[PDB]
Amino acid sequence: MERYENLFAQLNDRREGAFVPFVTLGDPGIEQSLKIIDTLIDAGADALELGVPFSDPLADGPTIQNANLRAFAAGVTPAQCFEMLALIREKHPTIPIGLLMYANLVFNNGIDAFYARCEQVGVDSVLVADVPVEESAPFRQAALRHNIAPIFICPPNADDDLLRQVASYGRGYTYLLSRSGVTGAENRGALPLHHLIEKLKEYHAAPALQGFGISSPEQVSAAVRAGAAGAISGSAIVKIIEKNLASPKQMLAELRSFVSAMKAASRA
Amino acid sequence: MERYENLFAQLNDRREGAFVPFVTLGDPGIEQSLKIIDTLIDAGADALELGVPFSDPLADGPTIQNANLRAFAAGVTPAQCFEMLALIREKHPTIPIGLLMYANLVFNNGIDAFYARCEQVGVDSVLVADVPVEESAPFRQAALRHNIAPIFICPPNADDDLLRQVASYGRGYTYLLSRSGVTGAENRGALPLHHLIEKLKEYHAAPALQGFGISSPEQVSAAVRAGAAGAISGSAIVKIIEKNLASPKQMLAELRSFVSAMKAASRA
Amino acid sequence: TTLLNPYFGEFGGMYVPQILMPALNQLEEAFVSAQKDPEFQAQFADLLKNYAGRPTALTKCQNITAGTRTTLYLKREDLLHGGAHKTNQVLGQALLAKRMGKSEIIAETGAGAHGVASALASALLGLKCRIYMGAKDVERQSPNVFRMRLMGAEVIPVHSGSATLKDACNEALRDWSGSYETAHYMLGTAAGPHPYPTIVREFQRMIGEETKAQILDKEGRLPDAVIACVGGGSNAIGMFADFINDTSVGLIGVEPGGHGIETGEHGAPLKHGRVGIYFGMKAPMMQTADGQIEESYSISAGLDFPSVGPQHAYLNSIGRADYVSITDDEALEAFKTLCRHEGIIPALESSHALAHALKMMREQPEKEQLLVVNLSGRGDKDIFTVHDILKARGE
Amino acid sequence: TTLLNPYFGEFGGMYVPQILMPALNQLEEAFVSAQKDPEFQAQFADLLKNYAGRPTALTKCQNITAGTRTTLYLKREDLLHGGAHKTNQVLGQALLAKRMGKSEIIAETGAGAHGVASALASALLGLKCRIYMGAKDVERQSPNVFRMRLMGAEVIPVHSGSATLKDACNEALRDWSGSYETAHYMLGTAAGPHPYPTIVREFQRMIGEETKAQILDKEGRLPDAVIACVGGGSNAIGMFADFINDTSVGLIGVEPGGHGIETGEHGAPLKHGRVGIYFGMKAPMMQTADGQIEESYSISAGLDFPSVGPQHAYLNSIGRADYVSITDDEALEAFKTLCRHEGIIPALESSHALAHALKMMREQPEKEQLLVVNLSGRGDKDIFTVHDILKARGE
């Protein structure tokens, strides 16, 4: 979790929001995924959200459903993803690395052992998409025992009790959901979040990152203006992968251009 | 009916049984059927039983079912059959001609009118296969008004009441059923009929003709020995037609040979 | 002589070969005896309740009558084991066969519903069952043929005549003409020679009896009309019987109009045929001008009997019951309507009855009327037929 | 917080994204309220009786047990409208959707039985219904797809993941994640996140309640065991619930053994899978060694749910219920046996329960035992599958 604490302190000194891309590990193959991730970092990503391919990604729309399918077509396994994660950390000392998991992959060989492996490879946070706060205890406890931030979701209609729970239990960052539904760039959130942002700060929550439907520079700047510490973009990034499967060089060029633009939007 | 009275008196003087073939009118076509019928007569038939093709011949086995179907394939109608009957009578003054009908063909354009047409063309008897004695009144009354013998069936298990009814109501001949079931040469009757024959004579019934499954000379002689006035053979005759469809001359040759043999069996 | 009147006015009778008369007399005696036998009635009631599922629901259909003054109930014979009302009377007839000491069953079938009903009753009661079916029906009703064979019945294709239902009816009679000492002929509708129209009515009359009780309970009065489709007449006479003496209750029978009465391609002999004698009875029938028996055409294969039971012809002649027709297209709109608005897939046979009730409603939507349609069976069997029409139509 | 315990021992829970928690809390409140509401109970009882046909028969099957000391009854859920027990709980859930002010229904389906059940309930109650179905199931279940479309439902093929039932389960949850203010997710089995395992049990428990009353009436005692097949667990928990406190009554659940447990080609996670977290619950499931969800294989497409309801896993763990498996070949011998000897065509799902009862009998034919099999549905839908096996086998 300390990598997030350091990042947000540095960004606060630079008067800057964080820009955080999501990709699926191993999409469209292990080697290309490693190059994709290095490109995202070189182009300005402040942190990463990384998905382990799962057969049943029920919080994801079609863009990311298809990313999971591509990684499976390449034979990507969770073991290979942990090898990837170790290599990513070996290349990049300070960038916060967060995983997007589904519960079965965490529980499968023991929840404690999962978080112990995360700590071994140098992961900083874990968001388990199908574990709500009510079911979170063994996940958040294992996370904290292994110096991993458990990432909690704050829905746009969170009542005071939920805000207080997410504020108390979470570390690293608070995931500020743009809207109901599932991941995807085709649906932009239309609800003002600044009240939630203010209450999370009042309750000393981990800094908020807005996510879901973030696909444009103006949304990154809007998140910062509303008081969030930054923004996460997944589908828009994965779209670029999907569009450019036939040309790995054009794929990296377009990823660089997009991430550069999105990061530029966070400074100002 | 008088033609039967005269025939049986003449046969009694000749110490002879009657041999009576059945064929379907118009099987396998009108012209060939006319030649078939003249051959049966020339070869020794004492009387004829003639079927009008009907869509639903429910007292007939497959051999005669198929004869009906052949006549229909040739477009044979009841009107054409009555034209045939008029021509047959115009050729042959004394031979008794009996029809085998199903009820709907008799009722269709009026029961009285049916029997009036029979009298006009020179038919001598009508057997309606699906009218039991219980339903016979309007049929037997119309028959008698038009000098047509109504032919009644005596089953091999007839009780005294049935024997008395068939004896009282019938004229021409009494049809002595060989067995239960439907027409066909493949099933020979195995029940002794001489008791029924004796009771029919006691009750002054029309002379008995045994029918169903008669296919061999020995059965004709057995019918005479049991006290019947003769025997009817249908399927065996129709079989010869069916076997020889491709060769009308061989058909007539085989019909002549069969009828000659069967008639010879009635003398002795 | 007989114990009961074999005629309904001038319709009905016993037009079978002499050889079959003792079989009809035996069956009539056994039936009259069984009807007085409280062990027989109890065994029948047990099978109807615990094996077949009686009583069947009476469903009030609100969505399809919304905004009119029609109240419509459906008597749910579709819920009976086997999916059609045929099950009631085959259970009774199988008990009659046992009563007479017979352990074999002969049955006819067109589209296969009665064949399946005969085969299930025979399987339950340990009877050896053989079923005649026109070869053309065999070829087009593989699902029902396989059901009969799974239930241990022998299915014998019939190739004579037109190779359809009437030809199977003849074949069953041919067989029975030789086998009646050991086999019972389990006739599939309220037609044929006496005593079958009477037996089949009495073994279907629980339809109308239950309907009367259910409508007294729900509405406090009798229906204005009860409406049933008419193939041979069994489901309709089963619904009508208990209401015949309730002279305020309309009895409406619906024959298949096929492509339209005027086309000649229909199955409506009661109103558009000609009285003849066939299949053991004097009754209206589909026939040529010179008296050959013809097929009944309908979109619904179960409405293929080419005549009608004699009690219907009689109830019509005296004006106690009224008979109408419904075309293929009207039946198919009623099928789609019930699926979409009530979640019930009706047999296309039953859809003719429903189509007529829908017309009674739509024509006079401010007329207060309490109607019951006999939903004689379910329509799972018909979804391919309906699919194919809708596709060829471009829906 | 919740009103009811979301767990059965260590099984169950609410493993959904945070965004769906208010939807589960709303549904739980509406259910608890409805269960105390005598207007709700009366409306449900009315639909169950007059629309669906309850109570269902309890049939004593004499031919199949002849010469043994087994008495076998079949609870006839095959006679319910729709042809399977699924109809009971979809009627209850549709009433819950109305109670919450919703007029839209979302449902998942594998082989299509629950899709058809959801579509009929929605058509009856005037609800707009959309049904998710894996594209591979769509392609192989044209009859059920057409039934859903005739009933006015939208069927949406799902192409993600393995394009089968689990992927439709995900898609229904994805949709509900955005639409729950106006739409109710009508889950098709006694599984998923709380409160569904509890709701589905309570809306199926009339199966066991009726069975208890019917067996007290017919035999004067409780059964020695009640036996039900286990897909997701709804028909089995519906039969078991009212007997759980009758500790002398055995509760036997039968999972599909497919080609044989040892082949890995089966659908028996309760006994041969591994506990995981998926579809909103912690439960035994079919999964790879590294935690990817797998398909359940059975000859019976209706036994394709790749996990099992959490109450079954709990009843097993405490030894209150016992779970066994039956292979494709055992199920197919039970299907043929019931057709031939009782005239009832059982669903291949239900045939697994019957196959296990037949084994209990045959293995120990002098053991006095009173058994009830839950005949969860009819098998008309299965006659092609069975035909094709028998042909390929040369029977």
Ligand SMILES: O=P(O)(O)OCCNS(=O)(=O)c1ccc(OC(F)(F)F)cc1
């Ligand atoms: O830009 P988009 O719309 O694709 O959104 C990207 C999100 N990817 S992620 O890893 O942050 C992410 C975060 C939370 C998710 O679900 C949960 F909220 F239920 F937990 C799913 C994915």
Ligand SMILES: O=P(O)(O)OCCNS(=O)(=O)c1ccc(OC(F)(F)F)cc1
């Ligand atoms: O020689 P077979 O076995 O073909 O029998 C030939 C009979 N042909 S027939 O016209 O006499 C004839 C006589 C009676 C019939 O049925 C009835 F008894 F019910 F009335 C049918 C045909």
Ligand SMILES: *Cc1c(COP(=O)(O)O)cnc(C)c1O
């Ligand atoms: C057989 C059948 C009919 C027609 O036969 P009836 O004897 O006239 O009742 C009607 N509906 C259904 C569902 C049938 O199976």
Ligand SMILES: *Cc1c(COP(=O)(O)O)cnc(C)c1O
């Ligand atoms: C759906 C279905 C099953 C299996 O589902 P459960 O939820 O386990 O009951 C079993 N039998 C039939 C007939 C079905 O339709």
Ligand SMILES: [Cl-]
């Ligand atoms: Cl009364």
Ligand SMILES: [Cl-]
């Ligand atoms: Cl009680």
Ligand SMILES: [Cs+]
């Ligand atoms: Cs905190």
Ligand SMILES: [Cs+]
């Ligand atoms: Cs005489």
Ligand SMILES: [Cs+]
């Ligand atoms: Cs009369």
Ligand SMILES: [Cs+]
């Ligand atoms: Cs109304």
Ligand SMILES: [Cs+]
């Ligand atoms: Cs008809």
Ligand SMILES: [Cs+]
């Ligand atoms: Cs717990």
Ligand SMILES: [Cs+]
């Ligand atoms: Cs027994």
Ligand SMILES: [Cs+]
């Ligand atoms: Cs299963």
